[PDB]
Amino acid sequence: SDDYEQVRSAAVQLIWVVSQLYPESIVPIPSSNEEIRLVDDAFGKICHMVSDGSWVVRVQAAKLLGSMEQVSSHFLEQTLDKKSGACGAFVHGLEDEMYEVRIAAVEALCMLAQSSPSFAEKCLDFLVDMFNDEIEEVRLQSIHTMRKISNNITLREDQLDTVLAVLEDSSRDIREALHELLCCTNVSTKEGIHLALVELLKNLTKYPTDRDSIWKCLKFLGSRHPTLVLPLVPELLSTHPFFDTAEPDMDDPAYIAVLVLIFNAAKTCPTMPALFSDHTFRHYAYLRDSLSHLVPALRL
Amino acid sequence: IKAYYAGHVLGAAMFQIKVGSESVVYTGDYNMTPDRHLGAAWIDKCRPNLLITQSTYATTIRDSKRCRERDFLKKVHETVERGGKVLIPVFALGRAQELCILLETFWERMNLKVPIYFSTGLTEKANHYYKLFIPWTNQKIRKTFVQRNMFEFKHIKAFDRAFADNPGPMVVFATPGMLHAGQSLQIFRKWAGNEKNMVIMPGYCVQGTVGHKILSGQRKLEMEGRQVLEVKMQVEYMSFSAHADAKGIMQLVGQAEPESVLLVHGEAKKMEFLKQKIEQELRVNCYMPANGETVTLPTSP
Amino acid sequence: ACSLIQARLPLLLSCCCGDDESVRKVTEHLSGCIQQWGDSVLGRRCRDLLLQLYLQRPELRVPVPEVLLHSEGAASSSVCKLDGLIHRFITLLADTSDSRALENRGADASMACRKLAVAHPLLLLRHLPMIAALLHGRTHLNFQEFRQQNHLSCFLHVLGLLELLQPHVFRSEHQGALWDCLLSFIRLLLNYRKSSRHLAAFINKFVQFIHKYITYNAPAAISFLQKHADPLHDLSFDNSDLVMLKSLLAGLSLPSPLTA
Amino acid sequence: IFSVIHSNDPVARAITLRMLGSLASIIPERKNAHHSIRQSLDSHDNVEVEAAVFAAANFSAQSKDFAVGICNKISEMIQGLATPVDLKLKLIPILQHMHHDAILASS
Amino acid sequence: WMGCRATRTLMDIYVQCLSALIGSCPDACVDALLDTSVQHSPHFDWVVAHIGSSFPGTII
Ligand SMILES: [Zn+2]
């Protein structure tokens, strides 16, 4: 409660240190006759510091909040609910004017979600809403953290709709980061897979030098989601029910990436070899020889 | 006197009044949660003898920012899904910018123009004032105004015509807020429908006829040749006014750390609860003055 | 590996041409062979060949013999020519949104899949992950539009197909997609707990299916229940008016109205 | 030149394949030509198959990717019992152009 | 009877007691249970039914 930001910053650093040194020790509340672990009390004190007037103290508070993982589950859940003075700590710490505190909060959410998958489920919507933030480094860090917590989660329909509606990226670094995120991502809806295919082909026709990383991207995307690609397979191959369709241009990168996706999905899915057309089998035999690092061996 | 940052509207300020050791801080109106175009209020450890705060919202936190925007856009999509029109009124200088940009970004998906019925001269003046006073705006805009001009809205309409047009998805932004008089009441009195005539109130509507009855059914009114509405017709009072809630007020009081607190710009039922909360929590005196009541405090200079 | 039978199958398929009098006779011969041998290597290869032939000639008049009850070849790399059509009407029935013009086609697809489950459960069993994945797109949606869009029709159809597919749906190989379907059901139970009385028929069907599941294969059902015991307990606390919900939860005591 | 590979006339296709084999030095790693060779190798017209063998020889001499992509197919045609002995003789010299990589040469 | 928390509590106590007996010597607990079932017949025997539900073999 000092009137100088440096004292508060050093004090929150020291309180983080002492909480990490004695987490399970019991500290009594002055007014209430409640026995509380020291780490939870320090969690509350640091959470209160995320509302500090100075932004450097807020950055420090968010970083140390990330660094602690011995806190109880309900205390972890409290910082995301609207309404132990730790209520809405990350909510206020994720929508500040300063971008640096937002980056610190994003990284803190990454560490906390990696420690707690149950926390990650709650953090999914908050972190994917952050993708709309228009500071470049903020969105790169959000991409990296989302990729980091990807193993413990699976995206929802509306959250995926949200991230897709603001997925229009221009620069190379953000695009490559999105490609890696989509390599590691987990989704629950095939409509999101369709929208991802649409955006990736737009980014295929828009950026030729992105072809490599989008081919690899779709190679990893289908290997993970074979079940969601199976309805979308006749949606994409343009297989007419009762007509032999024209043989698509084997040099068209968009089409070649649609086959890469559908063949990486087919690896896990017996039912995919059935819905292949004749030219689909012909094209498969070629890209298995020519692009064996993208196309996997199948059981036709 | 010293002016601080309030965050209510562009140029809103908290005015400290320091003479000798005695000092009084008047926050006027403020918002401790930053908007999409305005920052959060801040004041140093002034520790004054008295701190006069607004209390129009002594209610709990209004479910963050993303949830409110999501609910507002979901209601807008529900109203326009059946082809209904929307008739939100606003003062055209406060939360109008945030609602405008939010609805524009929502319309990036379908890309159909939305009519802004605040006067084209007034709209141009608002854009110009917001671009001349970039330092008063958010760091979000202060860092990204060079890259792009967010105030350059691609959707706008002039005035009377599209209001009496066919029942489409058009959402009107009336020039006078609070539904007290003007274009807002003129449009509202001529509009009805289940999906159409969606009236979303971001303001507070302190005592003006028609507008104030958001907590009521909004189907009674008091006027000559009054109309009736239906349940599907939006009478939702979205919490989009740039006012600090109870958590924000406690945050401000703890931030300033005053010797005493005084409450204005609110309702008595909310203000008595806020006073009880302040006295029970921070062990600091609070006051409940009525119009014409004189509140006197002692000083120890 | 089993790929040799797959590689020699086109020769057999070409030789048999399209006469069912030869396919039926060789299926009968294979059935007699496996009855003589059983689980031995010769009998196992005979079962694999019979399964491949049935998959590539699903017009057999002896579908799912007693031998194919134990067969785990549904997950194997064998191919069947019904995959395209079952995929077709699985998506024709999947979309049960506010577009009510498709309701008649959804009902036709549902009753046809019911007939298929009655007749050829094994063929529909290989496509179980497809319908399991298709259920994930409706649970997270809000209660109001879920009621309005009648998306519960697809869930009820899938649950009825599950009820018709048992005990074949309770085999060890078809467990991931079964768990996914049940997870989707309990998820939509949790989400729409404000007013769950509209799901009365769905709740009764779900309770009956879980009863049959814990009866046919108790350890698998117990493992699934332990996997998601906390969501079920939370549903029971929030929705305490569902007596069958609590009664089903009381069925863990074992080791881990209709009349004419 | 390449537009004639789509003709239904197998003689025209054979002449086009022979031209592509003759032009192999200025168009290696041309994917459409590679796919044309691969598709004409399993043709049912003997003149087209011979032209595809000649073009495959030239393109394996020129480009490494075609060689690695074709070595398995050439192997399966040579060892395939349905291939006549004369076509087997015609196919074996393709393997002399598998020197682009140590593992390819060993195979 | 689980509406009354005491009964559930006692059955939990019996899970602990029967596990302890299984650890040491599970012989006389079933004999005492049957003796009480005979003496306190027929109203207490639902406990024996639940116990048999937990352990089908020995109890049946
Ligand atoms: Zn004001």
Radius of gyration of chain A, in angstroms, nearest whole number: 24 Å
Number of helices of chain A: 16
Straight-line distance between termini of chain C: 54 Å
* Residues in helix, % of chain A: 55-70%
Q: Order of strands across the widest beta sheet of chain A?
A: 1-2
Q: Characterize the biggest β-sheet of chain A.
A: 2 strands, antiparallel
Strand and helix order of chain C: HHHHHHHHHHHHHH
Please give the share of residues in helix of chain C: 55-70%
Radius of gyration of chain C: 21 Å
Query: Outline of chain A, from the CA principal axes?
Result: elongated
From the spread of the alpha carbons, the general shape of chain C counts as globular
Ligand species: zinc ion
Largest sheet of chain C: none
Strand content of chain C: under 5%
Q: How much beta of chain A, percentage-wise? A: under 5%
Structure description:
- Chain A has 300 residues and is an all-alpha fold.
- In chain A, 64% of the residues lie in helices and 2% in strands.
- Chain A contains 16 helices and two strands.
- In chain A, a hairpin with a 6-residue loop joins strand 1 and strand 2 (35-37).
- Chain D has helices at residues 10-22, 31-41, 46-62, 64-79, 85-91, 102-106.
- Chain E is globular and about 30 Å long.
- Classes of the chains: A mainly alpha (300), B alpha/beta (301), C mainly alpha (260), D mainly alpha (107), E mainly alpha (60).
- Chains A and C meet through helix 13 and helix 15 of A and helix 4 and helix 7 of C.
- The structure holds zinc ion (ZN).
- Residues 8, 29 of chain B line the site of zinc ion.
Main traits of this protein?
part of a larger assembly, 5 chains, A: 300 residues, mainly alpha, two-stranded antiparallel sheet, D: 107 residues, globular, binds zinc ion, zinc (chain B), ubl conjugation (chain B)
Give the helix/strand layout.
The structure is cut from a larger assembly and holds chains A (300 residues), B (301 residues), C (260 residues), D (107 residues) and E (60 residues).
Chain B: E1 2-3, E2 15-19, E3 22-26, E4 50-54, H1 66-81, E5 86-89, H2 96-107, H3 120-132, H4 139-144, E6 171-174, H5 183-189, H6 246-256, E7 260-264, H7 268-282, E8 285-287
Parallel strand pairs in B: 3-4, 4-7, 5-6, 7-8
Antiparallel strand pairs in B: 1-2, 2-3
Chain D: H1 10-22, H2 31-41, H3 46-62, H4 64-79, H5 85-91, H6 102-106
Chain E: H1 5-24, H2 28-39, H3 45-54, H4 56-59
The site of zinc ion (ZN) has 2 residues of chain B, from loops.
